[PDB]
Design an enzyme around this catalytic site. Structure first.
Site, PDB file in Angstrom:
ATOM      1  N   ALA A   5       0.825  -1.206   0.000  1.00  0.00           N
ATOM      2  CA  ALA A   5       0.000   0.000   0.000  1.00  0.00           C
ATOM      3  C   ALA A   5       0.860   1.257   0.000  1.00  0.00           C
ATOM      4  O   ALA A   5       0.541   2.250   0.659  1.00  0.00           O
ATOM      5  CB  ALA A   5      -0.943  -0.002   1.197  1.00  0.00           C
ATOM      6  N   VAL A  27       2.926   4.221  -2.538  1.00  0.00           N
ATOM      7  CA  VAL A  27       2.437   5.166  -3.534  1.00  0.00           C
ATOM      8  C   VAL A  27       2.005   4.434  -4.798  1.00  0.00           C
ATOM      9  O   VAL A  27       0.894   4.637  -5.305  1.00  0.00           O
ATOM     10  CB  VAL A  27       3.511   6.227  -3.837  1.00  0.00           C
ATOM     11  CG1 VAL A  27       3.026   7.186  -4.917  1.00  0.00           C
ATOM     12  CG2 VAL A  27       3.883   6.966  -2.566  1.00  0.00           C
ATOM     13  N   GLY A  29       1.219   1.336  -5.327  1.00  0.00           N
ATOM     14  CA  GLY A  29       0.097   0.442  -5.133  1.00  0.00           C
ATOM     15  C   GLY A  29      -1.222   1.169  -4.983  1.00  0.00           C
ATOM     16  O   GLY A  29      -2.242   0.737  -5.528  1.00  0.00           O
ATOM     17  N   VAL A  30      -1.225   2.282  -4.251  1.00  0.00           N
ATOM     18  CA  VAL A  30      -2.459   3.036  -4.080  1.00  0.00           C
ATOM     19  C   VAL A  30      -2.888   3.665  -5.400  1.00  0.00           C
ATOM     20  O   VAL A  30      -4.079   3.678  -5.738  1.00  0.00           O
ATOM     21  CB  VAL A  30      -2.285   4.088  -2.972  1.00  0.00           C
ATOM     22  CG1 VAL A  30      -3.426   5.077  -3.014  1.00  0.00           C
ATOM     23  CG2 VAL A  30      -2.203   3.415  -1.608  1.00  0.00           C
ATOM     24  N   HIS A  40      -7.687  34.773  -5.933  1.00  0.00           N
ATOM     25  CA  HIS A  40      -8.976  34.301  -5.480  1.00  0.00           C
ATOM     26  C   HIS A  40      -9.889  34.126  -6.681  1.00  0.00           C
ATOM     27  O   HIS A  40      -9.952  35.026  -7.528  1.00  0.00           O
ATOM     28  CB  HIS A  40      -9.615  35.281  -4.500  1.00  0.00           C
ATOM     29  CG  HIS A  40     -10.967  34.848  -4.025  1.00  0.00           C
ATOM     30  ND1 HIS A  40     -11.141  34.054  -2.914  1.00  0.00           N
ATOM     31  CD2 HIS A  40     -12.209  35.072  -4.523  1.00  0.00           C
ATOM     32  CE1 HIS A  40     -12.428  33.819  -2.740  1.00  0.00           C
ATOM     33  NE2 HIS A  40     -13.098  34.424  -3.701  1.00  0.00           N
TER      34      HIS A  40
HETATM   35  C1  LIG Z   1     -18.678  38.528 -13.180  1.00  0.00           C
HETATM   36  C2  LIG Z   1     -17.505  38.868 -12.300  1.00  0.00           C
HETATM   37  C3  LIG Z   1     -16.508  37.918 -12.091  1.00  0.00           C
HETATM   38  C4  LIG Z   1     -15.405  38.202 -11.276  1.00  0.00           C
HETATM   39  N1  LIG Z   1     -14.441  37.234 -11.096  1.00  0.00           N
HETATM   40  C5  LIG Z   1     -13.419  37.517 -10.341  1.00  0.00           C
HETATM   41  C6  LIG Z   1     -12.412  36.494 -10.149  1.00  0.00           C
HETATM   42  O1  LIG Z   1     -12.433  35.373 -10.651  1.00  0.00           O
HETATM   43  N2  LIG Z   1     -11.367  36.872  -9.331  1.00  0.00           N
HETATM   44  C7  LIG Z   1     -11.230  38.106  -8.705  1.00  0.00           C
HETATM   45  O2  LIG Z   1     -10.237  38.296  -8.000  1.00  0.00           O
HETATM   46  N3  LIG Z   1     -12.185  39.059  -8.885  1.00  0.00           N
HETATM   47  C8  LIG Z   1     -13.220  38.771  -9.670  1.00  0.00           C
HETATM   48  N4  LIG Z   1     -14.184  39.725  -9.856  1.00  0.00           N
HETATM   49  C9  LIG Z   1     -14.030  41.010  -9.173  1.00  0.00           C
HETATM   50  C10 LIG Z   1     -14.415  40.929  -7.685  1.00  0.00           C
HETATM   51  O3  LIG Z   1     -15.796  40.587  -7.564  1.00  0.00           O
HETATM   52  C11 LIG Z   1     -14.168  42.275  -7.006  1.00  0.00           C
HETATM   53  O4  LIG Z   1     -12.826  42.695  -7.188  1.00  0.00           O
HETATM   54  C12 LIG Z   1     -14.451  42.206  -5.504  1.00  0.00           C
HETATM   55  O5  LIG Z   1     -15.754  41.662  -5.296  1.00  0.00           O
HETATM   56  C13 LIG Z   1     -14.318  43.561  -4.847  1.00  0.00           C
HETATM   57  O6  LIG Z   1     -14.424  43.397  -3.418  1.00  0.00           O
HETATM   58  P1  LIG Z   1     -14.888  44.572  -2.491  1.00  0.00           P
HETATM   59  O7  LIG Z   1     -14.986  44.093  -1.101  1.00  0.00           O
HETATM   60  O8  LIG Z   1     -13.964  45.793  -2.625  1.00  0.00           O
HETATM   61  O9  LIG Z   1     -16.336  45.024  -3.033  1.00  0.00           O
HETATM   62  P2  LIG Z   1     -17.683  44.252  -3.391  1.00  0.00           P
HETATM   63  O10 LIG Z   1     -17.421  42.820  -3.600  1.00  0.00           O
HETATM   64  O11 LIG Z   1     -18.277  44.917  -4.642  1.00  0.00           O
HETATM   65  O12 LIG Z   1     -18.538  44.395  -2.099  1.00  0.00           O
HETATM   66  C14 LIG Z   1     -19.137  45.647  -1.726  1.00  0.00           C
HETATM   67  C15 LIG Z   1     -20.320  45.358  -0.838  1.00  0.00           C
HETATM   68  O13 LIG Z   1     -20.723  46.555  -0.157  1.00  0.00           O
HETATM   69  C16 LIG Z   1     -22.127  46.654  -0.171  1.00  0.00           C
HETATM   70  N5  LIG Z   1     -22.460  48.057  -0.025  1.00  0.00           N
HETATM   71  C17 LIG Z   1     -22.126  49.073  -0.874  1.00  0.00           C
HETATM   72  N6  LIG Z   1     -22.506  50.255  -0.460  1.00  0.00           N
HETATM   73  C18 LIG Z   1     -23.109  49.997   0.758  1.00  0.00           C
HETATM   74  C19 LIG Z   1     -23.724  50.836   1.709  1.00  0.00           C
HETATM   75  N7  LIG Z   1     -23.833  52.163   1.572  1.00  0.00           N
HETATM   76  N8  LIG Z   1     -24.223  50.255   2.821  1.00  0.00           N
HETATM   77  C20 LIG Z   1     -24.123  48.933   2.968  1.00  0.00           C
HETATM   78  N9  LIG Z   1     -23.567  48.046   2.140  1.00  0.00           N
HETATM   79  C21 LIG Z   1     -23.078  48.646   1.050  1.00  0.00           C
HETATM   80  C22 LIG Z   1     -22.559  45.985  -1.473  1.00  0.00           C
HETATM   81  O14 LIG Z   1     -23.904  45.548  -1.358  1.00  0.00           O
HETATM   82  C23 LIG Z   1     -21.562  44.830  -1.553  1.00  0.00           C
HETATM   83  O15 LIG Z   1     -22.037  43.665  -0.896  1.00  0.00           O
HETATM   84  C24 LIG Z   1     -15.311  39.465 -10.670  1.00  0.00           C
HETATM   85  C25 LIG Z   1     -16.311  40.415 -10.875  1.00  0.00           C
HETATM   86  C26 LIG Z   1     -17.407  40.127 -11.684  1.00  0.00           C
HETATM   87  C27 LIG Z   1     -18.464  41.175 -11.892  1.00  0.00           C
END
Ligand SMILES: Cc1cc2nc3c(=O)[nH]c(=O)nc-3n(C[C@H](O)[C@H](O)[C@H](O)COP(=O)(O)OP(=O)(O)OC[C@H]3O[C@@H](n4cnc5c(N)ncnc54)[C@H](O)[C@@H]3O)c2cc1C
Ligand SMILES: Cc1cc2nc3c(=O)[nH]c(=O)nc-3n(C[C@H](O)[C@H](O)[C@H](O)COP(=O)(O)OP(=O)(O)OC[C@H]3O[C@@H](n4cnc5c(N)ncnc54)[C@H](O)[C@@H]3O)c2cc1C
EC number: 1.8.1.4
Lengths: 472, 481
Positions: B193, B195, B197-198, B459
């Site tokens: 068991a 590497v 063998g597994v 991420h």
């Molecule tokens: C389709 C898509 C795919 C993506 N894929 C990736 C990826 O694979 N990898 C990656 O690194 N990035 C990716 N991104 C980008 C990523 O989502 C953003 O960079 C990231 O979410 C930003 O984080 P943040 O905390 O600054 O803001 P946000 O994620 O935009 O969070 C802000 C939050 O604050 C809240 N909010 C705003 N104003 C207020 C208020 N006045 N009171 C209370 N709550 C409030 C909003 O509701 C929201 O929940 C993607 C974006 C999109 C649109």
């Protein structure tokens, strides 16, 4: 009735929710305000997570439905798409991760306030709930983490019906017969590829002359585009969209022209995806009343501790300058809060990776050739194709290459650019190398496990350092 | 000229003569040529690349990859994603063809690399016939003399036999026969068991076999694997359907008239005699260094008790211009280990310093989940009296693992109490094999757990679990768990 806090975070995205956890772990009495029904912000609810889920699922659909699985002896009579089920897998993952953030808040004693947050005093945040009720937080520090929103296209109104942003495109109820994507950046190529794989006729229209957004290496971008075109993803680069018309029969007429020139055409689609960019979100936050002015692109100016001009009010993530990425927001939130506790605050944006989760993947960190040329840095190039990599060949998944850029004199790694399998995971080894100031020779000499895709990173460095690789 | 096969028997002069074309030998030969040495590589088999390429890493990884996808389509995974299929059937001949195609392309690649680098390829059985001479005996009985300043022994390994069980690569197979089975066996027993063998057991279990592994020791995964990792790994494999009888010795096996095999077993220490019956018996209790008919005795190069060639830190044997590397010397029997030893040995021949840190050599198991580790296990740290701290992070809390619905396992980090130096990294789960190279890079710099926690990992990626485990080791708690 009011809550007293040390740190009040407005927003629960990657930047905000991690900052709130970190602040609580450091001993600050911490409140996090979120206006939406779930935590996790853009990335978790309408962003990274749902998009990657659909990319994963549609890739596997393509492997089963096309030629790949047959070539491996996995024979299937009838491969059918159940889009409702594929969407349910996506939604299940979003729900689990959003609930996880809620548990993490509880575990770390973060107070979660549901409402629309507005800064009503230098040391006060008021959260207004959907029914008009209010919750006042008197607080020593305020951390603005309000994130981003979709950038609208002037003259085209998104209705998330037939003209969608990324949010609507992530939840289409049926595979559209024909889809047009305005914008061939990361989001546009990812979402276009999802729906292309599921059967849609997809064309992306882009004003600029390359796909993949800002900062991507041009050689990588061209080779990436060529691969996507062979998959069936069509592109009209150097093309401007002049308008779109919602028609009576439910279809959309998109008018386009040569960006520079006059090749006026109209193309008709069932769904129009508008993803020309994203922009910082600060609406109704109270900034003007405070005198916190925005920069010309709507970002909050901050210093190296992420303080605004009002020193106990901070901002991080998509609402400030820098790459609009989840891991960038997370790190800014962490170090901002560390600084509040008196510690050093450091992030190197030249070590922040970018990833495109298509198949093949694309990922890079550091500088592109174009950026190095702009900056006058003399460099040397090492390339290694995945076609010559043992694990890639073993898997019969051999698109692309690793390209390393090294400083001519000092052999320091300046940039790493990966097109092919496993690029997203591999770029993190490259980010470590850049953070450490590694030389190309250093990386060539690390004992990488055989067979792994990472060996291509080793060999590409060897080519940059010694002039020649071993296996190519 | 660059190929010296049957009929090519003129004397050759060389600077460096490499005996064997496996991962160690063929890379040593390329590098030696690139350094300016007149380089000859002698290989007795029809193809280059040794054990790893022809009967080792490559064919095994191909079947692991393909059989995993078969499991995804044939089991529950594809259905849960909206990928609906009426009938998923295995075409084993076609799956074996994909494996063979990859081996063939890579073997030809080495031959092209030899030619591209002007390595003289001598096809024949090498024997050292003088302190500065190797004689190659070819298939047609011809002989060819190479007079050479240095000799690099890279003659590799072979399967370790089990006394009383005859491997015939029919129903009683070594790893070589197990990689080319003609049909999925109804029931398979695996002796060993470790590497290999597994990996091979998991391959055939996925394709429909009822698989039991029998192991004399009390853990799965071979030597040096972290015990917590090994136990959790075993538990995961058992849930997949992979059965284990640990702490069990095999007393014999009998091929019966009906074609099945009766395997007699007992408690390794004790007597709980049982018989288990299979259609195919895989014997993989170990591998051992290969030096047969090399001329060592006449040279006076005595072997150690396990058959390895003793060498010093420059990989010199007792005869200072005669060197040895790879599976024929001490250390982990791994392709990347053989390769690195070959490189630095030849660099040493050209006058450079020769140093390798075996604590930075990773091990990988390419099952699903994968297992990978580098540095020290907890058991090693305790043996050595090193005060350390532990950080763990489960893939169940990693965003990419959860999104892909692939959440087995965890990352475990071991850090030095005082300096926070990374001492060991142990990964059980998706992507472990690629991820361990980030840890290998860290160990080469003596990097800290905090160093790793503060790198901006993309991420969502599996690598964030590595970030978070380091954060837990460095600061006591992670962010997302
Ligand atoms: C389709 C898509 C795919 C993506 N894929 C990736 C990826 O694979 N990898 C990656 O690194 N990035 C990716 N991104 C980008 C990523 O989502 C953003 O960079 C990231 O979410 C930003 O984080 P943040 O905390 O600054 O803001 P946000 O994620 O935009 O969070 C802000 C939050 O604050 C809240 N909010 C705003 N104003 C207020 C208020 N006045 N009171 C209370 N709550 C409030 C909003 O509701 C929201 O929940 C993607 C974006 C999109 C649109
Ligand atoms: C099933 C299996 C799976 C494996 N998977 C992995 C894995 O995933 N990762 C990993 O790192 N390792 C793996 N290994 C181990 C790996 O293959 C070995 O560590 C590696 O091949 C050793 O390389 P080497 O160059 O020292 O010897 P070898 O690869 O054994 O090469 C020795 C060569 O020398 C030749 N030779 C010997 N004597 C003579 C002579 N007198 N004259 C001429 N030629 C001669 C032989 O024909 C052979 O080609 C696996 C092994 C097996 C069996």
């Amino acid at each position: 009735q009011p809550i007293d806090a040390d740190v009040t975070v407005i927003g629960s995205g990657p930047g905000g929710y991690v900052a709130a956890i970190k602040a609580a772990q450091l001993g600050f009495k911490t409140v996090c305000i979120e206006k939406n029904e779930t935590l996790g912000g853009t990335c978790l609810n309408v962003g990274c997570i749902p998009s990657k889920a659909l990319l994963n699922n549609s890739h596997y659909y393509h492997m089963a439905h096309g030629k790949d699985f047959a070539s491996r002896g996995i024979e299937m009579s009838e491969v059918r798409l159940n889009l409702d089920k594929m969407m349910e897998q996506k939604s299940t993952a979003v729900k689990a991760l959003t609930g996880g953030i809620a548990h993490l808040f509880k575990q770390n004693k973060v107070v979660h306030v549901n409402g629309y947050g507005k800064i009503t005093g230098k040391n006060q945040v008021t959260a207004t709930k959907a029914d008009g009720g209010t919750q006042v937080i008197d607080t020593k520090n305020i951390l603005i983490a309000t994130g981003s929103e979709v950038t609208p296209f002037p003259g085209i109104t998104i209705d998330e019906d037939t003209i969608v942003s990324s949010t609507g495109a992530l939840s289409l109820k049926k595979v559209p017969e024909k889809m047009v994507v305005i914008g061939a950046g990361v989001i546009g190529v990812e979402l276009g590829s999802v729906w292309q794989r599921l059967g849609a006729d997809v064309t992306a229209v882009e004003f600029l002359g390359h796909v993949g957004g800002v900062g991507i290496d041009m050689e990588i971008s061209k080779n990436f585009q060529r691969i996507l075109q062979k998959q069936g993803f069509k592109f009209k680069l150097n093309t401007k969209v002049t308008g779109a018309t919602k028609k009576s029969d439910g279809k959309i007429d998109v008018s386009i022209e040569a960006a520079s020139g006059g090749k006026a055409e109209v193309i008709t689609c069932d769904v129009l995806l508008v993803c020309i960019g994203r922009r910082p979100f600060t609406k109704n936050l109270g900034l003007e009343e405070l005198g916190i002015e925005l920069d010309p692109r709507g970002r909050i100016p901050v210093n190296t501790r992420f303080q605004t001009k009002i020193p106990n009010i901070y901002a991080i993530g998509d609402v400030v300058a820098g790459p609009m990425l989840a891991h960038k927001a997370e790190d800014e939130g962490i170090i901002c809060v560390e600084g509040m506790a008196g510690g050093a605050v450091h992030i190197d944006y030249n070590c922040v990776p970018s990833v495109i989760y298509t198949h093949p993947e694309v990922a890079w960190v550091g500088k592109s050739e174009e950026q190095l040329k702009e900056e006058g840095i003399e460099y040397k190039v090492g390339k290694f194709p995945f076609a010559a990599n043992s694990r890639a060949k073993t898997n019969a998944d051999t698109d692309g290459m690793v390209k390393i850029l090294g400083q001519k004199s000092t052999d320091r790694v300046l940039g790493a650019h990966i097109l092919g399998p496993g690029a997203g995971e591999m770029v993190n080894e490259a980010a470590l190398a850049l953070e450490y100031g590694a030389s190309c020779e250093d990386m060539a000499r690390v004992c990488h496990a055989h067979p792994t895709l990472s060996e291509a990173f080793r060999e590409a460095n060897l080519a940059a350092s010694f002039g020649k690789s071993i296996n190519f």
